[PDB]
Enzyme design. Structure first.
Site, PDB file in Angstrom:
ATOM      1  N   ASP A   1      -2.727   7.551  -1.284  1.00 49.66           N
ATOM      2  CA  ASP A   1      -1.716   8.656  -2.417  1.00 49.66           C
ATOM      3  C   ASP A   1      -0.852   8.911  -2.820  1.00 49.66           C
ATOM      4  O   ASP A   1       0.092   8.974  -2.040  1.00 49.66           O
ATOM      5  CB  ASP A   1      -2.781   9.931  -1.109  1.00 49.66           C
ATOM      6  CG  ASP A   1      -3.125  11.150  -2.166  1.00 49.66           C
ATOM      7  OD1 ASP A   1      -2.553  12.075  -2.779  1.00 49.66           O
ATOM      8  OD2 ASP A   1      -4.357  11.091  -2.197  1.00 49.66           O
ATOM      9  N   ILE A   2      -1.059   9.605  -4.051  1.00 46.95           N
ATOM     10  CA  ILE A   2      -0.052   9.120  -4.877  1.00 46.95           C
ATOM     11  C   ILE A   2       0.470  10.956  -5.114  1.00 46.95           C
ATOM     12  O   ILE A   2      -0.122  11.646  -5.423  1.00 46.95           O
ATOM     13  CB  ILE A   2      -0.317   8.752  -6.072  1.00 46.95           C
ATOM     14  CG1 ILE A   2      -0.297   7.123  -6.329  1.00 46.95           C
ATOM     15  CG2 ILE A   2       1.061   9.041  -7.210  1.00 46.95           C
ATOM     16  CD1 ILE A   2       0.759   6.478  -6.344  1.00 46.95           C
ATOM     17  N   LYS A   3       1.495  10.731  -4.781  1.00 42.14           N
ATOM     18  CA  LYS A   3       2.202  12.432  -4.554  1.00 42.14           C
ATOM     19  C   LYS A   3       3.514  12.415  -5.599  1.00 42.14           C
ATOM     20  O   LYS A   3       4.580  12.097  -5.366  1.00 42.14           O
ATOM     21  CB  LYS A   3       2.969  12.876  -3.758  1.00 42.14           C
ATOM     22  CG  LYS A   3       1.780  12.507  -2.317  1.00 42.14           C
ATOM     23  CD  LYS A   3       0.767  13.332  -2.172  1.00 42.14           C
ATOM     24  CE  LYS A   3      -0.382  13.760  -1.257  1.00 42.14           C
ATOM     25  NZ  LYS A   3      -1.263  14.448  -2.082  1.00 42.14           N
TER      26      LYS A   3
ATOM     27  N   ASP B   1      -6.446   9.172  -2.763  1.00 40.12           N
ATOM     28  CA  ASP B   1      -6.498   7.924  -4.342  1.00 40.12           C
ATOM     29  C   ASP B   1      -6.744   7.628  -4.524  1.00 40.12           C
ATOM     30  O   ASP B   1      -8.607   6.488  -4.915  1.00 40.12           O
ATOM     31  CB  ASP B   1      -5.095   7.913  -4.910  1.00 40.12           C
ATOM     32  CG  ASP B   1      -4.755  10.061  -4.929  1.00 40.12           C
ATOM     33  OD1 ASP B   1      -5.685  10.847  -5.475  1.00 40.12           O
ATOM     34  OD2 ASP B   1      -3.964   9.682  -5.922  1.00 40.12           O
TER      35      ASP B   1
HETATM   36 CA   LIG Z   1      -1.862  11.897  -5.416  1.00 47.42          CA
HETATM   37 CA   LIG Z   2      -6.837  12.711  -5.813  1.00 45.93          CA
END
Ligand SMILES: [Ca+2]
Ligand SMILES: [Ca+2]
Ligand SMILES: [Ca+2]
Ligand SMILES: [Ca+2]
Ligand SMILES: [Ca+2]
Ligand SMILES: [Ca+2]
Ligand SMILES: [Ca+2]
Ligand SMILES: [Ca+2]
EC number: 3.1.21.4
Lengths: 299, 299
Positions: free
Chosen positions: A142-144, A116
């Site tokens: 990265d955003i989860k 991201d």
């Molecule tokens: Ca993500």
């Molecule tokens: Ca993404």
DNA sequence: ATCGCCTAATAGGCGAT
DNA sequence: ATCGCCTAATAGGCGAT
């Protein structure tokens, strides 16, 4: 353009990757530095993060008639796909706040693949931390996001979100990672990381890769009779070792002290055998060091 | 959470949307302000934008063995999917540079759908420009990259990238946009925008939506014997009127002076009749005002 | 010129075991 | 607990007409 600085990048990459590999502590220092930097920033701007996140629910009338449609097998039907709320209100906001830190300079280096958020973070803190080795790192964040119906203790990562050994044999060639066989308690799969453990920019900048995962966790208010909305409940922060640490030194991916650090991901039998995502168990990653943290955002 | 500030948002939205609709010049002012703000920023940081963009090619060895795979019908096979290079090196970089402007404050308001970049841009310039109406706007910016094999004069927009009339009849209800019938020279289609022409935040902030499109255009060096890379060639900037201007006042979408401003998009006959993307012809949009600009980045 | 044929890559909810 | 079943939404290259 491919060959213009290739020799210089090639020579520097190989000499520098060997050094990194043989001195795992340097990479661990900058990785923990990145983790703690996000923890600091989330902490120092907690009201803003929670307010801009939860605001999506108040703006309900503006999207209620055009919500993201449901997807996946057997959606219960009472949840709204919340992917982008966490990506922007948390992920994008953090990138800006990190760059606003006095001593930090951010550079958005172009790359065709990856997580991201990606940027070269440069700072004198990294220079002393690495005792002069470098003053920069390539932040890979990265955003989860997950709700109360998915596990708050794992991460499902794509090949483009993990680095490998990154051998680069010949100049006209490039970095290559070895396939890895992930063995879980009941099933197994191959996982092939596509990211190199470090980058060397055309100007000689040494940028070890720092993989951070931000996991916003929302609560489903509707689970409580007549209440509505999906509010920010917590945020997990996790530092996943770069490829050299995972598969070379100390080789956490192969350490019996950390069995099942990795496990099969969520991709189905219709996915290419080489593009399957892999899970990282946060409960195990939590044992290899101060790599995981939980921040309560429900206040 | 859905109902907590609903009445206040409802009342303010309807009174404010009527005013906006009846005074199209205010919206046009802030829309052109947003456009010119991006033009300024790209201009003031041109070397950085081009350097971080083109850097993806120099980093070729790092991704050559794991490039984004080809997709679509009959790929020629000599191009590398360049989507993310423009998104980060241009799109994300601009968001940071805009926020660094002295007089501008950026807020990442959570929303479940929308364009690449979204944020509340607040500034005293907007307050005088709108003669006190508001000091904020909701920036909706999407990056659309093309190579020498696709048209540099159009935009293909998803429903989530265009606003409509946004009628909000009843309180317990929400904003709704009318379906639009796009009639091109040979074909026609329906297009249904999902974004409201303006937002009202839970604290009463009035945020008219400003839709901007950034179109990085790269050159294919390989088209020239033995040369390599996909370098930044130009950047188009385009301001697309919000829904009130397009379909209400002055109703550009229905003005014979601008026939074919909109045209069928790229979605195939297998796509839901209501989620089909629509094209905006930059050559026509260029006639409704100073809405389009081209910046040469090949220097 | 017009326009739609066509598919990679990302994402996480939720059930099946 | 494990793990994979399953599909929305974004994207633009490139041919067919
Ligand atoms: Ca993500
Ligand atoms: Ca993404
Ligand atoms: Ca529902
Ligand atoms: Ca700074
Ligand atoms: Ca090829
Ligand atoms: Ca500022
Ligand atoms: Ca996008
Ligand atoms: Ca885009």
């Amino acid at each position: 353009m491919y060959n213009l600085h290739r020799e210089k990048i090639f020579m520097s990459y190989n000499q520098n990757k060997q050094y990194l590999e043989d001195n795992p502590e340097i990479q661990e220092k900058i990785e923990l530095y990145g983790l703690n930097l996000l923890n600091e920033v989330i902490s120092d701007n907690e009201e803003e993060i929670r307010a801009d996140y939860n605001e999506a629910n108040f703006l309900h009338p503006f999207w209620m008639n055009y919500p993201p449609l449901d997807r996946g097998k057997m959606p219960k039907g009472d949840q709204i796909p919340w992917i982008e709320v966490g990506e922007k209100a948390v992920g994008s906001k953090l990138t800006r706040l990190v760059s606003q830190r006095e001593d930090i300079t951010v550079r958005e280096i172009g790359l065709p693949t990856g997580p991201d958020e990606r940027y070269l973070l440069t700072s004198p803190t990294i220079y002393s931390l690495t005792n002069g080795f470098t003053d920069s790192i390539m932040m890979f964040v990265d955003i989860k996001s997950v709700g109360p119906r998915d596990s708050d203790y794992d991460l499902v990562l794509s090949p483009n979100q993990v680095s490998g050994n990154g051998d680069w044999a010949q100049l006209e060639g490039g970095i290559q990672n070895n396939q890895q066989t992930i063995q879980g308690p009941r099933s197994s799969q191959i996982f092939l990381p596509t990211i190199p453990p470090l980058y060397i920019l055309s100007d000689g900048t040494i940028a070890p890769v720092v993989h951070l995962f931000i996991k916003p966790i929302y609560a489903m208010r509707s689970l409580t009779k007549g209440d509505t909305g999906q509010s920010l409940y917590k945020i997990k922060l996790a530092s996943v070792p770069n490829g050299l640490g995972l598969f070379c030194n100390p080789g956490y991916a192969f350490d019996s002290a950390y069995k099942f650090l990795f496990r099969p991901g969520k991709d189905d039998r219709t996915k290419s055998l080489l593009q399957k995502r892999v899970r990282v168990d946060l409960r195990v990653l939590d044992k290899i060091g101060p790599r995981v943290m939980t921040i309560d955002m429900d206040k």
